[PDB]
Enzyme design. Structure first.
Site, PDB file in Angstrom:
ATOM      1  N   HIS A   1      -6.156  -3.408 -12.074  1.00  0.00           N
ATOM      2  CA  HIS A   1      -5.350  -3.885 -10.963  1.00  0.00           C
ATOM      3  C   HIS A   1      -5.110  -5.389 -11.076  1.00  0.00           C
ATOM      4  CE1 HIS A   1      -4.442  -4.831  -6.638  1.00  0.00           C
ATOM      5  NE2 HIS A   1      -3.773  -3.695  -6.719  1.00  0.00           N
TER       6      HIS A   1
ATOM      7  N   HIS B   1       2.054  -9.605  -1.232  1.00  0.00           N
ATOM      8  CA  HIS B   1       1.103  -9.221  -2.277  1.00  0.00           C
ATOM      9  C   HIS B   1       0.017 -10.258  -2.540  1.00  0.00           C
ATOM     10  CE1 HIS B   1       2.723  -5.530  -4.059  1.00  0.00           C
ATOM     11  NE2 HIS B   1       3.925  -6.073  -4.133  1.00  0.00           N
TER      12      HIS B   1
HETATM   13  O1  LIG Z   1      -0.263  -2.746  -7.798  1.00  0.00           O
HETATM   14  C1  LIG Z   1      -0.077  -3.581  -6.881  1.00  0.00           C
HETATM   15  O2  LIG Z   1      -0.434  -4.768  -7.006  1.00  0.00           O
HETATM   16  C2  LIG Z   1       0.567  -3.102  -5.589  1.00  0.00           C
HETATM   17  C3  LIG Z   1       1.628  -2.216  -5.669  1.00  0.00           C
HETATM   18  C4  LIG Z   1       2.229  -1.770  -4.502  1.00  0.00           C
HETATM   19  C5  LIG Z   1       1.761  -2.217  -3.280  1.00  0.00           C
HETATM   20  N1  LIG Z   1       2.353  -1.766  -2.031  1.00  0.00           N
HETATM   21  C6  LIG Z   1       3.301  -0.671  -1.965  1.00  0.00           C
HETATM   22  C7  LIG Z   1       3.036   0.681  -1.740  1.00  0.00           C
HETATM   23  C8  LIG Z   1       1.796   1.292  -1.561  1.00  0.00           C
HETATM   24  C9  LIG Z   1       1.617   2.231  -0.553  1.00  0.00           C
HETATM   25  C10 LIG Z   1       0.386   2.851  -0.388  1.00  0.00           C
HETATM   26  C11 LIG Z   1      -0.673   2.542  -1.229  1.00  0.00           C
HETATM   27  C12 LIG Z   1      -0.497   1.613  -2.243  1.00  0.00           C
HETATM   28  C13 LIG Z   1       0.734   0.991  -2.405  1.00  0.00           C
HETATM   29  N2  LIG Z   1       4.212   1.302  -1.741  1.00  0.00           N
HETATM   30  C14 LIG Z   1       5.186   0.388  -1.952  1.00  0.00           C
HETATM   31  C15 LIG Z   1       6.583   0.551  -2.040  1.00  0.00           C
HETATM   32  C16 LIG Z   1       7.387  -0.566  -2.264  1.00  0.00           C
HETATM   33  C17 LIG Z   1       8.769  -0.447  -2.369  1.00  0.00           C
HETATM   34  C18 LIG Z   1       9.481  -1.316  -3.185  1.00  0.00           C
HETATM   35  C19 LIG Z   1      10.856  -1.198  -3.309  1.00  0.00           C
HETATM   36  C20 LIG Z   1      11.530  -0.204  -2.616  1.00  0.00           C
HETATM   37  C21 LIG Z   1      10.822   0.672  -1.804  1.00  0.00           C
HETATM   38  C22 LIG Z   1       9.445   0.553  -1.682  1.00  0.00           C
HETATM   39  C23 LIG Z   1       6.764  -1.805  -2.401  1.00  0.00           C
HETATM   40  C24 LIG Z   1       5.382  -1.894  -2.303  1.00  0.00           C
HETATM   41  N3  LIG Z   1       4.635  -0.793  -2.086  1.00  0.00           N
HETATM   42  C25 LIG Z   1       0.704  -3.100  -3.210  1.00  0.00           C
HETATM   43  C26 LIG Z   1       0.112  -3.561  -4.362  1.00  0.00           C
HETATM   44  C27 LIG Z   1      -1.052  -4.538  -4.225  1.00  0.00           C
HETATM   45  O3  LIG Z   1      -2.193  -4.217  -4.633  1.00  0.00           O
HETATM   46  O4  LIG Z   1      -0.867  -5.658  -3.672  1.00  0.00           O
END
Ligand SMILES: O=C(O)c1ccc(Nc2c(-c3ccccc3)nc3cc(-c4ccccc4)ccn23)cc1C(=O)O
EC number: 3.1.4.-
Length: 437
Positions: free
Chosen positions: A327, A102
């Site tokens: 965000h 992240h």
């Molecule tokens: O709000 C933010 O900050 C943020 C939030 C999520 C981010 N990725 C992400 C996404 C995803 C997919 C597609 C489009 C956007 C997000 N789906 C997941 C699923 C998990 C997961 C966790 C536990 C068990 C199973 C799955 C973990 C991360 N996932 C990235 C960010 C960011 O911006 O860095």
């Protein structure tokens, strides 16, 4: 500004609300330095878009993309980058299940010195268009003269701590950046680094990362005041993990305990969590598509309905950004009347055990799944006992620019947390559309 805390530009708000905001094109401009090379740590990348954000004269300088993608996702990122022979990639190891890279950080090496940018935006058009995002801009760090032996270290230990964060990757491309940092003078840095890296940390390493790193810094470099029990904790984020069947499992036991630490001696403390309601998203500049960047699944939410009683609406009249969905992630410790704060953190870390760490082995081990990075503003690092809260974000050395409204407003009885994978078909958004995922 001693703080060098900025918001990103928001397209569509009145110009007074973008005066002193920064777009990525401003950050990369020649006015900020003559770029030699750069490293872009992030989660998601649009490489075609990213290269266009660099000044034309700098578009062929080396760029390192630090990401966490695997398998087909990794292959897609490599395919995005392959037309650009100046772009190299570093895959951050994620050897604990369900972890994410992240961290959002730019390392900018110039002819004139070095700059570090720790921020909250993905490198895609949408994250810099109509969202509320935060940026910390380091000073221009000069190079230490050849043959001069000096630490280049700040009173916050930022130089060694940033190197330590990079060392956790165990990556050759980042060892080159470590060696660049060694050659620069970071002594003017007045923020503390708070990172997360994947692992299982025991003993002294326990305090290096995550919410134990925060706890350690608050114990060592903040002081407790009378009636500290009445100073709330505020957390503000864009994604919500599985926190357990009730608040005692993690949120109000180890997470809150770390967040309420002040000073070295040894709970009624109010906890405010700020997260967009469905109505916040529907009426936002982007409309329902803003919710594509507010990842909270119904599968997670339905197991922890207790949590939503802590939720407060997004409101940011102070910065003209009530309709610019957040965000940014921020955590802070206001006074009971919200006129002062004891500290402020801007970070990538969402409200999740993966990001902050969860204790294991009878409280002796902190397990972290993800890479996260933020910077902590402590009054003591500025010669102060507390920060006054800036009344209007865009309207000085004692006055911290909190980017949203205080006190936070509790959800109404008809409000619901934004949950990204269920439909919303009862009221259209600002573009006239419904949400059918
Ligand atoms: O709000 C933010 O900050 C943020 C939030 C999520 C981010 N990725 C992400 C996404 C995803 C997919 C597609 C489009 C956007 C997000 N789906 C997941 C699923 C998990 C997961 C966790 C536990 C068990 C199973 C799955 C973990 C991360 N996932 C990235 C960010 C960011 O911006 O860095």
């Amino acid at each position: 500004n001693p703080f060098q805390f900025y918001l990103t530009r928001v397209s569509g708000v009145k110009p007074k609300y973008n005066s002193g905001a920064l777009h990525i094109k401003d950050i990369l401009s020649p006015l900020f330095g003559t770029l030699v090379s750069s490293a872009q740590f992030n989660y998601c990348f649009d490489v075609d878009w990213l290269v266009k954000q660099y000044p034309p004269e700098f578009r062929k300088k080396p760029i390192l993309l630090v990401h966490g993608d695997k398998r087909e996702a990794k292959a897609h990122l490599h395919a995005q980058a392959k037309p650009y022979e100046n772009i190299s990639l570093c895959q951050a190891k994620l050897d604990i299940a369900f972890g994410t890279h992240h961290t959002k950080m730019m390392l900018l090496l110039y002819e004139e010195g070095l700059r570090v940018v720790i921020h909250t935006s993905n490198l895609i058009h949408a994250d810099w268009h109509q969202k509320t995002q935060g940026i910390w801009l380091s000073p221009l760090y000069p190079r230490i003269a050849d043959g001069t032996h000096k630490s280049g270290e700040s009173p916050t230990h930022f130089k060694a701590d940033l190197i330590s964060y990079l060392m956790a990757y165990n990556a050759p491309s980042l060892k080159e950046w470590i060696d660049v940092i060694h050659k620069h003078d970071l002594s003017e840095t007045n923020v503390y680094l708070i990172g997360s890296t994947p692992g299982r940390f025991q003993g002294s390493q326990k305090d290096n990362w995550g919410h134990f790193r925060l706890k350690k810094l608050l114990k060592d470099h903040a002081s407790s005041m009378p009636n500290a029990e009445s100073w709330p904790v505020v957390g503000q984020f864009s994604s919500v993990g599985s926190l357990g069947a009730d608040e005692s499992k993690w949120l109000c036991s180890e997470f809150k305990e770390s967040m309420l630490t002040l000073g070295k001696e040894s709970s009624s403390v109010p906890l405010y969590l700020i997260y967009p309601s469905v109505e916040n998203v529907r009426t936002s500049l982007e409309g329902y598509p803003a919710g594509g960047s507010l990842p909270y699944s119904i599968q997670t939410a339905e197991k922890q309905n207790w949590l939503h009683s802590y939720f407060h609406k997004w409101s940011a009249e102070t910065s003209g950004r009530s309709n610019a969905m957040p965000h940014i992630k921020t955590y802070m410790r206001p006074s009971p009347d919200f006129s002062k704060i004891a500290w402020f953190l801007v970070t990538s870390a969402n409200l999740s055990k993966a990001a902050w760490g969860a204790l294991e082995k009878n409280g002796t081990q902190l397990m972290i799944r993800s890479y996260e990075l933020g910077v902590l503003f402590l009054p003591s690092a500025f010669g102060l006992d507390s920060f006054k809260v800036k009344q209007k974000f865009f309207a000085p050395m004692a006055t911290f620019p909190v980017p949203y409204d205080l006190p936070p407003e509790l959800y109404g009885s008809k409000d619901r947390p934004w949950i990204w994978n269920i439909p919303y078909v009862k009221a259209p958004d600002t573009h006239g559309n419904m949400w059918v995922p």
